[PDB]
Design a protein around this ligand. Structure first.
Ligand SMILES: COc1ccc([C@H](C)NC(=O)[C@@H]2CCCN2C(=O)CNC(=O)c2ccc3ccccc3n2)cc1
Ligand SMILES: [Ca+2]
Length: 226
């Protein structure tokens, strides 16, 4: 199936990604709090809803929140500033708070039911966000020799998400707090950092196949833009 791409709202970041966030892939965005990873998740939850000439996939979004990061008023602001109806935009986002890592796994199985339901409609699910993927796994699988079991549980969770992305042609977008020696299984990893007082900077990590460079974007009333 053709890969679909969702615009991030920034021409700079879209160029770095090769057009935007891809379906049939897991894109992992990592950085410090406020680096723009949650702002990007919120922007994408709106952008995916737009028609393709506007950078979307005429789709709906599903958002798994592990750290109480979801702000429905922020989605409303992005939608209104982009010429969209905020209530209709919120109606196209399914939201769930994951209480722990095991509940986070169950939520992914429930996501598949909604995805299957809407697959052949005029507005299928096209984006699944997990913000953040690792927080519960890092707090639960902790201490002496916990690395092996945590990485096995994370590897399994990521395999389930890769399956939803590939089987249903959806973009899976996950965020992560930031160690350097651990393995990662995302299709694409993006490092975000706070820039020159106002900007945010993005770099691709371990992607020889994709272009060398860094993107610069801003957090605005429209979510993410140049
Ligand atoms: C004014 O404050 C607001 C606060 C939040 C919202 C959000 C956008 N909308 C909702 O909360 C809506 C309205 C009430 C129920 N509801 C759900 O989305 C219920 N969700 C689910 O049943 C569900 C199930 C499995 C899932 C697996 C993965 C990800 C998400 C999943 N969501 C809107 C306004
Ligand atoms: Ca952020």
């Amino acid at each position: 199936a053709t890969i679909g791409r969702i615009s991030t709202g920034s021409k700079s970041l879209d160029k770095l990604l090769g057009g935007g966030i891809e379906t049939q892939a897991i894109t992992e965005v990592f950085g410090e709090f406020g680096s723009g990873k949650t702002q990007l998740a919120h922007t994408l939850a709106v952008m995916v809803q737009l028609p393709p000439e506007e950078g979307g996939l005429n789709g709906s979004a599903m958002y798994i929140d592990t750290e109480n990061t979801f702000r429905p008023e922020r989605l409303r602001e992005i939608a209104q500033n982009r010429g969209l109806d905020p209530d209709e935009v919120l109606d196209n986002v399914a939201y769930a708070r994951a209480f722990n890592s095991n509940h986070q796994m169950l939520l992914v199985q429930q996501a598949e039911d909604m995805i299957k339901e809407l697959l052949n409609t005029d507005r299928p699910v096209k984006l699944l966000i997990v913000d953040s993927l690792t927080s519960h796994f890092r707090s639960e699988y902790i201490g002496r020799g916990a690395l092996a079991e945590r990485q096995q549980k994370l590897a399994k969770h990521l395999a389930d998400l890769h399956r939803l992305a590939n089987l249903y042609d959806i973009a899976v977008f996950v965020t992560n707090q930031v160690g350097h020696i651990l393995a990662h299984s995302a299709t694409l990893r993006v490092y975000l950092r706070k820039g020159k007082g106002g900007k945010r900077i993005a770099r691709l990590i371990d992607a020889p196949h994709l272009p060398e460079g860094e993107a610069v974007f801003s957090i605005t009333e429209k979510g993410i833009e140049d």
